[PDB]
A paper describes a structure:
As a member of the Embecovirus, [name] uses a primary glycan-based receptor (9-O-acetylated sialosides) and a secondary proteinaceous receptor for host cell targeting and membrane fusion. One unique feature of [name] spike is that the C-terminal domain (CTD) of S1 (also known as receptor-binding domain, [name]) is exceptionally larger than other CoV RBDs, and the receptor-binding motif (RBM) of [name] adopts a unique fold. Proteinaceous receptor of [name] was identified as transmembrane serine protease 2 ([name]) and [name] [name] binds [name] with nanomolar affinity. The [name]–[name] interaction occurred between a groove formed on the [name] [name] apex and a hydrophobic surface near the active site in the C-terminal trypsin-like serine peptidase (SP) domain of [name].
Using bio-layer interferometry (BLI), we determined the equilibrium dissociation constant (KD) for [name]–[name] interaction. The affinity of 1A-[name]–[name] (KD = 323 nM) was ~2-fold lower than that of 1B-[name]–[name] (KD = 170 nM), which is consistent with the KD values reported previously. Reconstruction of 1A-[name]–[name] particles yielded poor EM densities, whereas reconstruction of 1B-[name]–[name] particles yielded clearer densities, despite the resolution of 1A-[name]–[name] map estimated by gold-standard Fourier shell (3.34 Å) is similar to that for 1B-[name]–[name] map (3.95 Å). Given that high-resolution crystal structures of [name] [name] and [name] were separately determined by our group and other groups, we fitted the [name] [name] and [name] atomic model into our [name] [name]–[name] EM density map by rigid body fitting. The fitting was unambiguous and the models fitted the EM density well. Further, we compared the structures of interaction regions in 1 A and 1B [name] that directly contact [name], which gave an RMSD of 0.9 Å, confirming that this region adopts a similar fold despite amino acid variances between [name] 1 A and 1B. Except four residues on apex of β-hairpin (residues 509–512) which have minor shifts, all other interaction residues are nearly superimposable. Variations D511Y and H512V between 1A and 1B [name] may alter hydrophobic packing interaction; variations S487K and T507D between 1A and 1B [name] may affect salt bridging contacts, which on the whole results in different receptor binding affinity.
Author numbering:
A (entry chain B): 129 to 492
B (entry chain A): 322 to 610
Amino acid sequence: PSNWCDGVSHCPGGEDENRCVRLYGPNFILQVYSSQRKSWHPVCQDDWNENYGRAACRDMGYKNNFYSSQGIVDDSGSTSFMKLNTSAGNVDIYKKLYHSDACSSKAVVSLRCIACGVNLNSSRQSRIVGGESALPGAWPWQVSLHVQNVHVCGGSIITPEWIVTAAHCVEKPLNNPWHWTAFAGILRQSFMFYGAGYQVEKVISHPNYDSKTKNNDIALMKLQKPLTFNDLVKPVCLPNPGMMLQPEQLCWISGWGATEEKGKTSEVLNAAKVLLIETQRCNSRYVYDNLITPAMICAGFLQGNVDSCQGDAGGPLVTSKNNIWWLIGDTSWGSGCAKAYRPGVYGNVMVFTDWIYRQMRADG
Amino acid sequence: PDLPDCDIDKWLNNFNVPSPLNWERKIFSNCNFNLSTLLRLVHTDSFSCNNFDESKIYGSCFKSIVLDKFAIPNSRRSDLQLGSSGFLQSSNYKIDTTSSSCQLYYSLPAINVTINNYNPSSWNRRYGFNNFNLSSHSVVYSRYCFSVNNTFCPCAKPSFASSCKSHKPPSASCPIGTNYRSCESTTVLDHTDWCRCSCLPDPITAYDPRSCSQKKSLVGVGEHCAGFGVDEEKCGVLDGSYNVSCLCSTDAFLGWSYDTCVSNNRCNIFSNFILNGINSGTTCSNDLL
């Protein structure tokens, strides 16, 4: 896992560095790490068929899932592109790639390994503090995780088999997957009782997670049975490095958290709009006194009244961009609820995107 | 008729000219006045009347004439247009548009005029402010005004601050009968004595106004500025006991700036004329026989 994509070859064959693959941009432009130049370069559309996309998604920790793949005009400004060749008789794509100045079709590959980031149309949903009721189907990735059939922390899905949440909920002695039980696609907490559970087969925690500063707070729950996708349950695409996330950008938070501090959890799932807070704005002596690690995100309003609470932990921090939702943050902790000068503090998924894939491939 | 002159001209050309923060106002009554003599004695730039006739001013009797004067900054000349929302109109002086009023633009040489700056807010001078340490021919104008009540303190309780390991604010003793500064204590991630207080940054930059004791206000017709920023985190000294007094330093006062009034070696001063009781009273005019 941790030996993957580090610049040092571990196995004698060198598959660790030759098969380093990731996506890029909101339009999902594929990149392949070049060991000769220690840089990421996109791939050409020329002489490419979907059988190679199968292997690409397989090595990207997505197994056999493959939604669609088409060629798009290049936008990252890269000077070099990987070029495939059909003369080689081998079945491995990465030995078929070589550097070229440009592609003949003047296009790069847009790879979609899973149909994510799409939900049913919803008009009015601001159910977190100071708002109105919500509607089903707008947040199908949001799931609830239960211990002894009561809610503890929320969760969001990215694949039919994996659920991501916060590590402080899975802290000792709750590091046993037998105690956890997940429910998917149910809005009312009074309905997730009879046979709607999805048991977690193994819990995954961050190796460098530290509870004193609550940094590197990430956790991955894996189910035995893959989730059957329909209108009420859909995944959310994992965000890619290279998106210009503007300040103040309108984001959405969700969860079963309380409507006030120290209060009871909400009966129905709540979701309301919040805004980004820049990290250099948050890690000053003023907001949290250098408490924000680069793997942490501050979101919400400094004026308060719209913020996460207890029970909102494990919820998704999502934004809309090119009609695709992106899971950029995970609710780690919050100093108070709906209060000024102490907004919601979220864990940075973007730093741990590669770590998620490292755990995905080794547990496939 | 056996009754002296108003001597309006002798008041406008006085070498002591105030600022829009502390604009003066004099009331003229039961006296004779001449607008033509005023026009020729003092170099008047512009003369415009709002909802009134300039020709009917000559030889007309009034009840009382209300006057204002303050040297004008060069930067905010555009604020004097009717219906504006500039710094001068929203924080220093609002013009009476409804009443029949005339606007006077007159100037004095810079070799004799002496500028005067004063703070009209009571609680501003109560909590540390003394005067304005400004340059010669400098006009002080207020960005915004903050209105507080009689029970407002910019200093926290020393007993509360004795247990604030992190971010302990300066503390002192309020005058008796007043209410202490609002503060609260929490703890986050091994900051066992974390302490935060309302209006932590500049009160203009204060994100939450409801919990902030200082409330921004708009100046009315005849009123003055309510107050300054008066940053509280600089009010008093660190580790201050009850023997020290709640005093804010000079740099703590915010929401104000300055600009000169010179224009071709001539300081420009704005005057507003308010006329009451047209064709009435005894302070008639002798511009006509």
